Amino acid sequence: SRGEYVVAKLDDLVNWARRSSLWPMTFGLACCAVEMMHMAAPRYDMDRFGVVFRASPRQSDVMIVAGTLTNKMAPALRKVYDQMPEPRYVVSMGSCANGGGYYHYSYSVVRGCDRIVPVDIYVPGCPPTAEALLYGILQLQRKIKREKRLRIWYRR
Amino acid sequence: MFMINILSLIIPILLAVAFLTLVERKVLGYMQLRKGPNVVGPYGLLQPIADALKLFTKEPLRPATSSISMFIIAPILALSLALTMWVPLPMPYPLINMNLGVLFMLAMSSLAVYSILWSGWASNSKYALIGALRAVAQTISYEVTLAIILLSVLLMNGSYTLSTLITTQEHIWMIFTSWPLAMMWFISTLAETNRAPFDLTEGESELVSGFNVEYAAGPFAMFFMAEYANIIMMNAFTAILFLGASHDPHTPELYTINFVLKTLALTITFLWIRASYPRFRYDQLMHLLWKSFLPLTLALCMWHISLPIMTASIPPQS
Amino acid sequence: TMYIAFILSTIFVIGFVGFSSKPSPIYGGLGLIVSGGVGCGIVLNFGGSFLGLMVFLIYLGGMLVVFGYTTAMATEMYPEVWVSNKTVFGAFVSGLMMEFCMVYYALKEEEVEIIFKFNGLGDWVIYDTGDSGFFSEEAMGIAALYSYGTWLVIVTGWSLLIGVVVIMEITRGN
Amino acid sequence: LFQAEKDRRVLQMLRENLEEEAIIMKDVPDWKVGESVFHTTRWVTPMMGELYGLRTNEEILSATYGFIWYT
Amino acid sequence: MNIMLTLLTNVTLASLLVLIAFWLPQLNAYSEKTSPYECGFDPMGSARLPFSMKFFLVAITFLLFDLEIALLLPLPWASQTNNLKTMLTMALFLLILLAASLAYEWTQKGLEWAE
Amino acid sequence: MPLVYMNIIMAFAIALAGLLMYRSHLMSSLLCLEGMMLSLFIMSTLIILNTHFTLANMMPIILLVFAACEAALGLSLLVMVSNTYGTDYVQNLNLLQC
Amino acid sequence: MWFEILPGIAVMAACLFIPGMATAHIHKFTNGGKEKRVAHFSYQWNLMERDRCISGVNRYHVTKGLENID
Amino acid sequence: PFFDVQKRLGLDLDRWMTIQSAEQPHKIPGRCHAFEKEWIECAHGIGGIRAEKECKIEFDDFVECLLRQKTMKRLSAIKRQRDKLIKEGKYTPPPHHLGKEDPRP
Amino acid sequence: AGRIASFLKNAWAKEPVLVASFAIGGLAIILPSLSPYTNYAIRINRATPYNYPVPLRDDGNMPDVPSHPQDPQGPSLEWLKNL
Ligand SMILES: COC1=C(OC)C(=O)C(C/C=C(\C)CC/C=C(/C)CC/C=C(\C)CC/C=C(/C)CC/C=C(\C)CC/C=C(\C)CC/C=C(/C)CC/C=C(/C)CC/C=C(\C)CCC=C(C)C)=C(C)C1=O
Ligand SMILES: CCCCCCCCCCCCCCCCCC(=O)OC[C@H](COP(=O)([O-])OCC[N+](C)(C)C)OC(=O)CCCCCCCCCCCCCCCCC
Ligand SMILES: CCCCCCCCCCCCCCCCC[C@@H](O)O[C@H](CO[C@H](O)CCCCCCCCCCCCCCC)COP(=O)(O)OCC[N+](C)(C)C
Ligand SMILES: CCCCCCCCCCCCCCCCC[C@@H](O)O[C@H](CO[C@H](O)CCCCCCCCCCCCCCC)COP(=O)(O)OCC[N+](C)(C)C
Ligand SMILES: CCCCCCCC/C=C/CCCCCCCC(=O)OC[C@H](COP(=O)(O)OCCN)OC(=O)CCCCCCC/C=C/CCCCCCCC
Ligand SMILES: CCCCCCCC/C=C\CCCCCCCC(=O)O[C@H](COC(=O)CCCCCCC/C=C/CCCCCCCC)COP(=O)(O)OCCN
Ligand SMILES: CCCCCCCCCCCCCCCCCC(=O)OC[C@H](COP(=O)(O)OCCN)OC(=O)CCCCCCCCCCCCCCCCC
Ligand code: SF4
Secondary structure (H helix, E strand, C coil): CHHHHHHHHHHHHHHHHHHHCECEECCCCCCHHHHHHHHHCCCCCHHHHCECCECCHHHCCEEEEECCCECCCHHHHHHHHHHCCCCCEEEEEHHHHHCCHHHCCCCCECCCHHHCCCCCEEECCCCCCHHHHHHHHHHHHHHHHCCCHHHHHHCC | CHHHHHHHHHHHHHHHHHHHHHHHHHHHHHHCCCCCCCCCCHHHCCHHHHHHHHHHHCCCCCCCCCCHHHHHHHHHHHHHHHHHCCCCCCCCCCCCCCCCHHHHHHHHHHHHHHHHHHHHHHHCCHHHHHHHHHHHHHHHHHHHHHHHHHHHHHHCCCCCCHHHHHHHCCCCCHHHHCHHHHHHHHHHHHHHHCCCCCCCCCCCCCCCCHHHCCCCCHHHHHHHHHHHHHHHHHHHHHHHHHCCCCCCCCCCHHHHHHHHHHHHHHHHHHHHHHHHCCCCCHHHHHHHHHHHHHHHHHHHHHHHHHHHHHCCCCCCCC | CCCHHHHHHHHHHHHHHHHHHCCCHHHHHHHHHHHHHHHHHHHHHHCCHHHHHHHHHHHHHHHHHHHHHHHHCCCCCCCCCCCCCHHHHHHHHHHHHHHHHHHHHHHHCCCECCCCECCCCCCCCCCCCCCCCCCCHHHHHHHHHHHCCHHHHHHHHHHHHHHHHHHHHHCCCC | CHHHHHHHHHHHHHHHHHHHHHHHCCCCCCCCCCCCCCCCCCCCCCCCCCCCCCCCHHHHHHHHHHHHHCC | CHHHHHHHHHHHHHHHHHHHHHHCCCCCCCCCCCCCCCCCCCCCCCCCCCCCCCCHHHHHHHHHHHHHHHHHCCHHHHCCCCCHHHHHHHHHHHHHHHHHHHHHHHHCCCCCCCC | CCHHHHHHHHHHHHHHHHHHCCCCEHHHHHHHHHHHHHHHHHHHHHHHHHHCCHHHHHHHHHHHHHHHHHHHHHHHHHHHHHHHHCCCEHHHCCCCCC | CHHHHHHHHHHHHHHHHHHHHHHHHHHHHHCCCCCCCCCCCHHHHHHHHHHHHHHCCCCCCCCCCHHHHC | CCCCHHHHHCCCCCHHHHCCCCCCHHHCCCCCHHHHHHHHHHHCCCHHHHHHHHCHHHHHHHHHHHHCHHHHHHHHHHHHHHHHHHHCCCCCCCHHHHCCCCCCC | CHHHHHHHHHHHHHCHHHHHHHHHHHHHHHHHHCCCCHHHHHHHHHHCCCCCCCCCCCCCCCCCCCCCCCCCCCCCCHHHHCC
């Protein structure tokens, strides 16, 4: 149908922009954030793909939870996630962010950042290499490529 | 046809702003041993389009503590004045030919000051307030120094008309004539446009996005467009003021090519400086102009008052 | 006609009504900036481009300091806006109503105030037919501050230097 | 040359304004056509509305604002 | 006229960009999203409290120096007069008095910020 | 007199009435005082430009100079009052009585 | 390599060409193939108004000459 | 009250700016230079009382040139009468007043 | 002279900006009173004809006033032509 074709093209265009312009919030917790710096480094330059760190959560699209999430830190992470406007995505990085990690059976560690925020991508490793994190970012981009919001709305 | 001329002045400026964003990305990357955006399009040519679409399709939010009226007006004022600053520029023919073309630019810059102040105050947050007051101090210093420097340089010209600037620089360059004022003017234009090392109103390392901390999506993109348009406009003003291009009335496109090349060189120098230097402290910026530039600016103003009189080289009034 | 100067004068009075109703120094400075720009427009239409640009630039610089001072000295928990307070809104509405009544009476008939007599006709009518040539009369008169007006320059410079000394002495404390 | 042209143009505009005033203010009880507002008989320059008073808005606007609005 | 049309065009374009920004995207606002940002933790006080200005004297001196630049601006036309000696004397007098003001404030420590 | 002069004089009168009617802040009254001089500047330049009084064109600039000198004086007094009391409220200026 | 920056700079330069060239072409189009008349002073404005008056078509850029005086 | 130091010492501090018929730059004339000259030459040397009593004609002409009140009254009267006449169709403006003419150069 | 030399050496090592500023200001104050082209600038400003040269009524006793612009009497700008 003409309307179906129009909405398909429009949300192909919309998903392309969001996929190609990703702005992670400048947010790192532990040793996993060093591999974020090495992904930002010249070797695996993240700025090629349109992935740029922004300090303010208002101007951020993705939250890369890279490090251990503690009980004393969970409210701040939830606060910045809430203050991030939509559409927003979450990439947990490393064992600590995925589940508990080396500190799973601890009194002061949250066993998974997905207990706090909805996580879109999980990156495995301790720490995941910069290439592993880049693969996770590209996988997030491909996940964005498949979103059909206007197509869902047209048939709604 | 005047509306067509307005559109032909506005739309290419916005396109050049977007591609200046791209160029700054790539230049900083290559100076930092990276490549910069080269994935979104061929050599990363669709990156500005992707960024604009993402920003204008993302949700904007007004903070619960904000004053909504001045929260919305500030990006409007910033972008409106950034676009308005271009109308008296002769390239080689101004869109609007003014008798006092420089005082209009000074007044419009001083008005464009208030966009960041009102956005910082309206946001109702401590980082925004700090950014606004840093803007206040920066504007104080750069405003006084810029006013006196422009007075001297135009005193070498004879009037406040930029076409008269072209006629003055028909033979040699104001950079050859008055290079110390040119250096101080370049520093003052950096401060006016809030570029490194004077990017203190929005200092990421110290403040979390500074005055535009609460701004997101479309309103933020307007602040970015206003900043980059101001960068290009100030570099164009510097090129017209100090690097005068030869003008042929029957083929004016040559002046356009020369002027565009000089403006691009100055803008790339801006990006180069940002890549090279650290950031000032705003008290040190105030002490830089007041305690160093201001005495030398006054001495050079006296010298450029005296010089045409003692050498019988006073420019024509018209 | 096009009543450009009259419309600008009305906007000037509206900005005055605002910053005189005095919501809070932020919005008072906003209204004063608007009034300065509109007065620049008025005197540009009347002929003085240098004077209009100068008053606009001077008041833009002056309201910058006022903003920094009201952020530090003249701020409260809930800064007042025109609709926030009953007194401020009352003064604002009173000024607007008085201005509208004066404008309506002046447009409908030759309104004679208790102080002055005002005729409802063209600001273009009141102008002069003659013209200057190859120079600006306003620019020449202003530039005459140095050839003529040596005394004015002396007293003005002395006043500015004494003002610097004074502001240093007032804020000395101790 | 321009001074002579300006004088002739001003005098012609004043004369045709006077003719139209004679046509218009004919039934007015107490009205003298062409009466001066000055005690002196010395020539006084027309102000702006003595020339472009009974003329079109385009002409009036051009005469009163064309130079200032030309940019 | 032309300048008014240009200003109206620029303001209309900026307002249209704002209107597109606030109506085109999908909106979803709640209390936590619109709360003030203080790096993840609730602000202790309010942003409308007094904010000490340690360069208060420099702002007043800036007002006076803005007056000085306003006085100095008509110099390009003033240099077209026949009384060049008087004009030069007055211009140098104004600039020397401005320099004296700057030197006096500098020596009396008015350019230093409050601690 | 045209209606432009009426509007400028009305603006001066409004700014004068604002100054004479304090609310709480001294800064607001300082802003009202600054507006009166803006109206004076506009009126003076409208009068001078209309009568082609060429040598009088320098008067409005001197007017602005002494305007901002008065503004500087008011700001200095305001900072001293604010240091003394914590607020720029005119209610605290009540130690002296008539 | 560093020459991959050039296409973006080329696009920016091409964008910056449009305003000035467009203004020049529009001025030549609306002034009869000649430069737009600069009137910084009342003398020049009066010259333009006289050109409008003597043209007979209400366009100052329509210039007349010896064939018009005789 | 008034210590005429300028007159005593032969100085000129503000008398150059007191009136609009004095020496102006580039010999730019005032709007009412002739009327001010006539009034000043009438009132010179006779004092304020006699100047107000006897030079009232010159002063009235000067004020009329300055403010243009009688001229505006005449113009408004003519405009009102013309508008009333054209309201009832009793007056037809000439083509040269309607914009269908070739003015003088 | 020794004290002056020591002061200049110390200032040039501590405040070169201020030394340059004061030197430029002093040269701006002093040089115009010595240059022989100040009077040339005054003459060039005088020679500029902003307004119309209203002619004088000939009384028959004006030998220094030209009858035609190209007559030898009257001011000459031959000095300005070769300058
Ligand atoms: C907190 O712990 C920490 C971390 O965390 C865990 C860290 O990581 C690090 C490590 C730190 C680093 C690695 C440093 C940061 C990394 C970097 C790479 C720094 C480099 C920074 C930059 C390169 C700056 C880039 C920033 C931004 C925001 C660029 C984004 C671009 C924009 C916002 C521009 C968008 C706006 C645009 C494009 C405007 C254009 C829009 C328009 C609408 C214009 C078009 C208008 C028109 C009218 C055109 C229409 C015309 C048409 C249709 C016709 C034209 C004709 C045709 C033919 C088409 C540290 C130290 C740390 O301590
Ligand atoms: C104030 C500005 C005035 C001038 C505007 C000039 C044109 C502006 C051009 C820019 C438009 C920017 C938005 C682009 C489109 C995307 C957003 C969009 O579609 O928004 C539309 C909005 C969309 O509503 P929304 O609030 O759901 O918007 C969110 C939209 N999505 C989901 C896409 C994010 O439409 C409406 O608000 C109205 C919908 C129909 C209901 C009509 C109610 C009655 C009132 C209006 C109809 C006329 C009544 C006549 C009779 C009156 C008397 C009884
Ligand atoms: C700037 C001012 C606003 C502009 C308004 C819009 C103007 C036109 C917008 C420009 C559209 C650009 C489209 C770019 C196409 C993407 C190129 C191509 O590579 O994309 C492919 C296809 O993309 C998607 O299938 C759809 C892309 C968009 C399709 C076009 C939709 C219609 C656009 C034209 C209509 C514009 C007018 C209507 C809106 C105003 C998939 O690539 P991708 O997998 O990701 O790359 C992975 C990286 N690799 C290769 C290294 C691995
Ligand atoms: C010395 C007396 C001390 C006791 C009294 C103190 C009073 C204050 C100090 C007053 C000193 C100045 C008084 C003399 C003013 C001169 C005014 C004018 O007549 O002289 C000018 C000559 O000026 C000279 O160049 C020197 C002027 C003075 C230079 C500055 C010295 C004053 C410094 C004051 C310091 C601040 C103290 C003042 C406030 C207390 C005019 O020259 P000219 O070119 O023909 O004018 C052209 C006009 N045309 C076009 C019609 C022909
Ligand atoms: C038009 C294009 C111009 C291009 C020029 C660009 C230059 C390179 C750009 C990179 C610099 C940009 C970032 C740098 C920002 C900071 C710059 C800076 O610091 O300079 C100020 C610098 C720092 O001072 P401090 O080290 O803090 O010492 C304080 C002592 N108490 O000091 C200055 O003010 C330098 C001022 C330069 C003015 C030029 C000097 C004048 C030379 C005098 C000779 C001319 C005399 C004229 C009379 C001639 C008579 C015949
Ligand atoms: C007099 C004719 C010139 C007219 C005015 C000149 C133009 C304007 C210059 C005046 C502006 C203000 C000057 C202020 C002077 C005193 C300021 C001061 O306090 O300086 C001190 C004192 O330092 C000094 O050394 C005083 C300056 C001495 C320089 C004066 C030398 C005079 C030179 C005369 C000509 C010599 C020619 C040499 C040529 C060399 C090559 C150019 C240092 O400041 P700090 O507090 O230490 O900095 C902050 C630290 N936290
Ligand atoms: C040649 C003639 C012209 C040809 C092209 C014509 C169209 C051009 C584009 C016009 C502007 C967009 C028009 C509206 C697009 C559809 C929007 C829509 O219907 O969105 C509905 C839906 C909302 O969500 P829903 O599924 O309803 O579920 C409720 C959520 N719990 O889903 C959403 O809201 C999804 C979120 C995004 C919606 C906004 C973006 C839509 C696409 C805009 C593309 C252009 C962007 C331009 C930006 C400004 C310029 C830079
Ligand atoms: S997963 Fe490993 S590398 Fe990452 S934060 Fe935990 S301990 Fe550090």
